[PDB]
Amino acid sequence: MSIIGVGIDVAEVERFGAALERTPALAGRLFLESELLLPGGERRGVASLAARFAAKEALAKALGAPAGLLWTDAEVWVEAGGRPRLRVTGTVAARAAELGVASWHVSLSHDAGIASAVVIAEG
Amino acid sequence: MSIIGVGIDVAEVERFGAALERTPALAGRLFLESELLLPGGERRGVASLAARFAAKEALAKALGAPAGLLWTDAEVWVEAGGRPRLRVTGTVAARAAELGVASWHVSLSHDAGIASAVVIAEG
């Protein structure tokens, strides 16, 4: 296997939060319902959502996309042991397929002020 | 040899510095003496410490963010020529063995306001 693309995004949380206020609308366009909520039903706060949006931007960059994605065609989930994962369908899985990606590696991070993600696509 | 896990962490230096101030015992829970003490014996500055803790956090995420790992079981050192490295012992060395980790790649960085790191685990 070989690296196909890498992506990084680092976002100020307060700014991301302000963007969600500006049309909401946005949240529904950015996130699947499953991304908004923990398995126990608790609602994610803004820093954690910012990290999930950063992962999607990082995936868009790893795929060489110029103007983002059909965001709902990408899904950040978390394995039982805690490792984040990306699931891609439709438009994003098509882009993935034409590049030859067989494997994503993703890491997410946040504190209250900064959220980040990195994605490595291999194939 | 293949990518097993990736980790990233990006932290506000001011926030890390606040946490260390809230709790004087925190520095010695996160760091070995070798990381805390500059040559000559002055305490390593907050920003440089923040980057090192970002590296241990990114290492944790590269290993799939598992239960039971002491921060002191990972050490950031700098080899001749300046590349950072990670020496792992005890709980962290056990987790890496178990995942079949053969080698690590790490980078870290800071300015006065923001510290960051990325870790790639290969096996």
Add this chain to the structure above:
Amino acid sequence: MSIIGVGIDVAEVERFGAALERTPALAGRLFLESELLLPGGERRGVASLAARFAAKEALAKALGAPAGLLWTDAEVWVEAGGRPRLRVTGTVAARAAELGVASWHVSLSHDAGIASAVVIAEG
């Protein structure tokens, strides 16, 4: 192919901005004209420029260059489709050859307050 080095850099945009305004000759030490200018001919804004500098700092780290690079021997450019790339010449190309680097992967990002980049070198 294996990973030879990794680099990350995350910068506060305002701090980078402040530095360039203290020493206005400095932009031309760090950046080629192609990096300073947008497709239309106007100077890139500070956040977008800080991402290109982050990418050079990340490249320097991936190459084990502790004192930084001869900056203008590295040029960040973007493929028609949207993927950023690093062209290296002179001292930087020479360093990559010394280390046996065969290919580079780069991603950069900014918002208004934070710029970042990650470089992976493989060979």
